[PDB]
Amino acid sequence: SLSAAAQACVKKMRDAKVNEACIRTFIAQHVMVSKGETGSIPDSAIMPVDSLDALDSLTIECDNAVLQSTVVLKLNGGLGTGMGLCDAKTLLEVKDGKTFLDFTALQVQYLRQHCSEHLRFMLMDSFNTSASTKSFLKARYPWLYQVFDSEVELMQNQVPKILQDTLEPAAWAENPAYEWAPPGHGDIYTALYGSGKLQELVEQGYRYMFVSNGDNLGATIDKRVLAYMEKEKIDFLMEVCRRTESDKKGGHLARQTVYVKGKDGQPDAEKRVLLLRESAQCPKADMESFQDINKYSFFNTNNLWIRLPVLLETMQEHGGTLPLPVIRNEKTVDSSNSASPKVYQLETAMGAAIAMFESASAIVVPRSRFAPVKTCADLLALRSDAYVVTDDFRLVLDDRCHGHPPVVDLDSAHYKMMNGFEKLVQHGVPSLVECKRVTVKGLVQFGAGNVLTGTVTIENTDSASAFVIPDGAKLNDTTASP
Helix, strand or coil: CCCCHHHHHHHHHHHCCCCHHHHHHHHHHHHHHHCCCCCCCCHHHCECCCCCCECCCCCCCCCHHHHHCEEEEEECCCECHHHCCCCEHHHCEEECCEEHHHHHHHHHHHHHHHCCCCCEEEEEECCCCHHHHHHHHHHHCHHHHCCHHHHHEEECCCEECEECCCCCECCCCCCHHHHEECCCCCHHHHHHHHCCHHHHHHHCCCCEEEEEECCECCCCCCHHHHHHHHHHCCCEEEEEEECCHHHCCCCEEEEEEEEECCCCCCCCEEEEEEEEECCCCCCCCCHHHHHCCCCCCEEEEEEEEEEHHHHHHHHHHCCCCCCCCCEEEEEECCCCCCCCCEEEEEECCHHHHHHHCCCEEEEECCHHHCCECCCHHHHHHHHCCCEEECCCCCEEECHHHCCCCCEEEECCCCCCCHHHHHHHCCCCCCECCCEEEEEEECCEECCCCCEEEEEEEEECCCCCCCEECCCCCEEECCEECC
């Protein structure tokens, strides 16, 4: 009953022993692409979301019992490539010798000893981060290592990249691994169901799952969110932030009205759902509208809260799968060769799931809960005294920051990657708790005991090479140069 091209995919995935849940999900996607699915979402098909509740307005915490049925999961499939690293992103040092992973593991341990010893902690890995993650925990957190396979790791699937002209499994004899690729974080739902872990957590009594990027340290367990969901009876909750001028490029939250047929089960219906729209899915005709941060003022933080039982049920009603809108990524089999066969890489975003539930909601949260470390510049801020560690092992701004983190702007071609960045801070990390903005242009090196206040710019004339700042140097509202 499949197009043969879809049959080749199935065959290929079964030969490599790809679980069936993944195959099903991927095939439905293949079918949609086969029908010429655009993914397009014109402004005329959505409406803005004018108001949502706020995490700052909330005050009630859930009792420790709710946490006993909670699972904390961190996306950990990423490498520090964009930062000149090939190890797991979460294994990057963030503060005083601690990595992202250390902090989440410690936050978890803290909740297990003071609130709920049954709080579950999971990591979504890929073939690229698994080994390194395992040996890290083995050395630093034996209690998680002992149960690494049984309850910590969730292995992300890998699907076949397909040729654009025929939609059949691409081939690259040079490097067969290039024929496969991850299917986006949306695959989290597939992996959970397919691996048998969803069914297992639900039957064990787990009710809530909080998912967030491993590199987003501001994404911690907030008891107010669980209470709010228990009270409003929410099955899926997306944390969102107000879009600023810098976000007018990123996706946003939107409203949509649907009418579903439904034959022999439930009569027709007209529902109002919530969805996400990326730039990709936006037609240049409405691209201007897409950037009007005053119309669409909210963006997905990727901090999601899902009611596991409901997730299982819905996936079951859909034939053991979750029909998320497919994203058709255009690439070449070998990224490193513009002449390699053009292909489509099918993926989904986990935030798209917000449209899959009747009791879905979004809540506005402060920017502090969306603190991804994407560049070494973001790492500098974190390493500095601008951020302190709480007793329950959370990373928050120091009080003298007033909720405003130092704006750090490091010159690429020098600090775009750990390679050069560690040089810059080789002799020490300057104090930035009182610094509004720091910009580094050209090859520079902080001294030691350096203290920056106000706005500071450090630029190297014309690359005389190596501009080492004096030690104890107190730069205030200045432009240091040689």
